[PDB]
Amino acid sequence: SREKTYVKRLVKILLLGADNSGKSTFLKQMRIIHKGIHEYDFEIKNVPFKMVDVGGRKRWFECFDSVTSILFLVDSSDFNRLTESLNDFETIVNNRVFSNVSIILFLNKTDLLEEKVQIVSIKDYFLEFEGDPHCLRDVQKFLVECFRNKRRDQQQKPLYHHFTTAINTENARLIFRDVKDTILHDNLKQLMLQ
Amino acid sequence: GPDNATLQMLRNPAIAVALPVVYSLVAAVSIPGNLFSLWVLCRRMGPRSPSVIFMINLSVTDLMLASVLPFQIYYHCNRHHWVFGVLLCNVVTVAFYANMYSSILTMTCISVERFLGVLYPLSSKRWRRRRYAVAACAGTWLLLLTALSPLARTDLTYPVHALGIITCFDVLKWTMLPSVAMWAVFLFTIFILLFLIPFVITVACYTATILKLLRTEEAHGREQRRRAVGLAAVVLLAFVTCFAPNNFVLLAHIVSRLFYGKSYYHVYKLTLCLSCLNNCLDPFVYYFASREFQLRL
Amino acid sequence: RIQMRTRRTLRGHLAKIYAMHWGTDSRLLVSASQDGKLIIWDSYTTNKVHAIPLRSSWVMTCAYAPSGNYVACGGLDNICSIYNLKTREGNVRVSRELAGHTGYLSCCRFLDDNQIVTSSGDTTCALWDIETGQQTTTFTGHTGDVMSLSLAPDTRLFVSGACDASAKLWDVREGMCRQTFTGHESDINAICFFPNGNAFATGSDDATCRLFDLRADQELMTYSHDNIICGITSVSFSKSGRLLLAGYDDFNCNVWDALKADRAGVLAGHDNRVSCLGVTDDGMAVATGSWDSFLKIWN
Ligand SMILES: CC(C)=CCC/C(C)=C/CC/C(C)=C/CC/C(C)=C\CSC[C@H](NC(=O)CC[C@H](N)C(=O)O)C(=O)NCC(=O)O
């Protein structure tokens, strides 16, 4: 009965960063400030959010439609397996059911990135032109563009990206704002206003 | 009997040309367009969202306003002489004003519903429920048909023996209400509730909605924020240019009759055909303009 | 030609329906959705006789026991949870929590109040005893994920279908494959025994329904048409075996004459994708479920 007026308010987010990312610390920080698959219910600014920690598989994963946004975590510092994280992302972001869900990237470990950038070349791991290897802004815009340009023929859906340290509270405000902007651009179609 | 200024107004050559011409153009466009609008909007789309059910009310309201215009065209081609029944004089002056305010009240609901769906995409999802759109439509009629109630009850026809005519709302009686003070109480209450609140709320809702889409700074979808700002800006301009001249001239007439004896009715009557262009504009300005409707056409 | 009409509509699920199962009493049914409630309905009266909130929202299958004493479900949790409807206190509660598959649970079906058989995305099927709470027999041989399974009418054998496009027959008491069948061009999503226990039907992403017979050892029939550019999500016979019913991606269910191969009818009461279909043990009614969040009852 009254469950319909809760399920009608609900936002679903799919969380699917790799095992070496900050994901376990992120879910722990989220749970205190507000076997396999897990499913977390919380509320931001009086909107109920459900966040699904999927098991990290043919089209029965299509039960992840009606997800509003996909949240991806990558450890930016681990240049040796950044290519594996980027191939994992490429199998997600180009699936037909995820044609109308927005993508959020957190580049995690950026407090380790600002040290490793002074110690080792990023260009030694990649084909593309990388600029001078000792600058933060250049490794940041290089990694962001390398993930971004891995999209195939992207239209209608936005992709968002942010830089994340050892864990902090503001991540829930970032994913709220990207979801809000994803739903504003959906609402324009529902309002016959697009 | 009626004053000279009234007898002069009921022989005016501009009213006898302007309203028959403009009404006939409005009725010829807006009957088929509100009847194709609905077919698609209602039987071809479905009342699944709060936006489609406010647009079903709007097109139903206008169609019923457009369908009484043939009585008005005849009454202004004949020189202010009503030939039909006393009952049908009551039915026509109610079907005229109840609908023309219903449009203003419905367009107000769609403005609040977009100020909500754009400015609060997530937070307003409680208020984004079809049941509450149905409630606001029912509340619109219920507010109208109580505030306009007297026009259903009293005889609205008047025998004017100077010119040899019977008028239809074109002249009224001072016994309809107990005193001049009760005319002022009645008319300024129906003005504030049926025009001035709906007007100020509609203009504010669109202004904040256009400014929100212009000030937004995301890179993706700038090409579709502009589409939204263009659609909203045309709707605001169509609402203001149709309803503002007529209702602010009405306020100046009601004041002038009550407190100074004078009249601006002929100016009101002329702005009333500008307010009827809406029934043509609505279908082009809301329905035909949007890709979601155009795709099913 | 059969022109079935909607005899009832059931309102109470909130998201896309993903499974349903009639009871042996031929009057109650259990149903499941991606909002994670089972609802038990009375199909004569529309009463919500029970609603049961599940331990995980991702339910992909549910079942009703041959006595009506118990119900079960599973999905992306890799588990088959059992619930008891006949507690002395009166509230519904967990009887067992069967765990041990490597993949998501794709189907489960009771044999009696004490044994249940299951299929998984890990290519395997398994039989369980509900009092001991572990696998009593494991069945292996498919090259990819198993989508659906059917018991025979006597529960001595079962069939299952998979992403390798080959339907296979298993002996419940032996624990090894009895027969293997081929003919589809793509994954089998759905499978159903014929009422005599000597044949079964199948449905696929290849848009064909196909009939197999255990003594013929090959396909007897194919049901198809040129314009069906989409997959089949669910399949079952009517009680007489003469009509075969199936659900498709393009929002509709089709009816076929099992012996003449004609498209004997169409059901089109949904405005989002059909996910499940099933027929009463008296043969008097058909149920359907879809991404609309409404079930519909048909005759
Ligand atoms: C307000 C709203 C939001 C909606 C619709 C209602 C509406 C538009 C009402 C009309 C406007 C007004 C002011 C109407 C009535 C005028 C007033 C205040 C009193 C009655 S005037 C009587 C009448 N004279 C008229 O001249 C009739 C009214 C006519 N509509 C006009 O103003 O010429 C007359 O018979 N005089 C001779 C006599 O009786 O001795």
UniProtKB/Swiss-Prot annotation, chain A:
Residues 49-56 are annotated as: G3 motif. Signal peptide: none annotated. It is found in: Cell membrane; Melanosome; Cytoplasm; Nucleus. GTP binds at residues 108-111, 166. Residues 104-111 are annotated as: G4 motif. Palmitoylation is critical for proper membrane localization and signaling. Expressed in testis, including in Leydig cells and in the seminiferous epithelium, in differentiating cells from the spermatogonia to mature spermatozoa stages and round spermatids (at protein level). Expressed in 99.2% of spermatozoa from healthy individuals, but only in 28.6% of macrocephalic spermatozoa from infertile patients (at protein level). Residues 164-169 are annotated as: G5 motif. Belongs to the G-alpha family. G(12) subfamily. G proteins are composed of 3 units; alpha, beta and gamma. The alpha chain contains the guanine nucleotide binding site. Interacts with UBXD5. Interacts with HAX1. Interacts (in GTP-bound form) with PPP5C (via TPR repeats); activates PPP5C phosphatase activity and translocates PPP5C to the cell membrane. Interacts with RGS22. Interacts (in GTP-bound form) with ARHGEF1. Interacts (in GTP-bound form) with ARHGEF11 (via RGS domain). Interacts (in GTP-bound form) with ARHGEF12 (via RGS domain). Interacts with CTNND1. Interacts with GASL2L2. Interacts with GPR35. Interacts with GPR174. This is Guanine nucleotide-binding protein subunit alpha-13. The gene is GNA13. The chain holds residues 204 to 377 of 377 of the full protein.
Swiss-Prot record, chain B:
It comes from the Eukaryota. It is found in: Cell membrane. GO terms for biological process: G protein-coupled receptor signaling pathway; Rho-activating G protein-coupled receptor signaling pathway. It is a multi-pass membrane protein. Keywords: Cell membrane, G-protein coupled receptor, Glycoprotein, Membrane, Receptor, Transducer, Transmembrane, Transmembrane helix. Changing residue 198 to L: Loss of protein expression at the cell surface. The gene coding for this protein is located in the pseudoautosomal region 1 (PAR1) of X and Y chromosomes. This is S-geranylgeranyl-glutathione receptor P2RY8. It comes from Homo sapiens (Human). The gene is P2RY8. The chain holds residues 8 to 304 of 359 of the full protein.
Swiss-Prot record, chain C:
WD repeats lie at residues 5-53, 54-99, 100-140, 141-182, 183-226, 227-268, 269-299. The keyword Transcription does not apply. One of its GO terms (biological process) is adenylate cyclase-activating dopamine receptor signaling pathway. The modification Phosphohistidine is found at residue 225. Keywords: Acetylation, Disease variant, Host-virus interaction, Intellectual disability, Phosphoprotein, Repeat, Transducer, WD repeat. Phosphorylation at His-225 by NDKB contributes to G protein activation by increasing the high energetic phosphate transfer onto GDP. Changing residue 55 to L: In MRD42; decreases receptor-driven G protein activation; decreases trimer formation with alpha and gamma subunit; no effect on protein abundance; no effect on complex formation with gamma subunit. Gene3D superfamilies: YVTN repeat-like/Quinoprotein amine dehydrogenase (2.130.10.10). Changing residue 50 to R: In MRD42; uncertain significance; no effect on protein abundance; no effect on complex formation with gamma subunit; no effect on trimer formation with apha and gamma subunits; no effect on receptor-driven G protein activation. InterPro entries: G-protein_beta_WD-40_rep, Gprotein_B, Guanine_nucleotide-bd_bsu, WD40/YVTN_repeat-like_dom_sf, WD40_repeat_CS, WD40_repeat_dom_sf, WD40_rpt. Changing residue 51 to T: In MRD42; decreases receptor-driven G protein activation; increases trimer formation with alpha and gamma subunits; no effect on protein abundance; no effect on complex formation with gamma subunit. GO terms for cellular component: cytoplasm; cytosol; extracellular exosome; extracellular vesicle; heterotrimeric G-protein complex; lysosomal membrane; membrane; photoreceptor disc membrane. It comes from the Eukaryota. It holds the Pfam family WD40_Gbeta. Changing residue 39 to N: In MRD42; also found in patients with acute lymphoblastic T-cell leukemia; reduces interaction with GNAI2, GNAI3, GNA13 and GNA11; induces activation of PI3K-AKT-mTOR and MAPK pathways. One of its GO terms (molecular function) is protein-containing complex binding. Belongs to the WD repeat G protein beta family. It comes from Homo sapiens. The gene is GNB1.
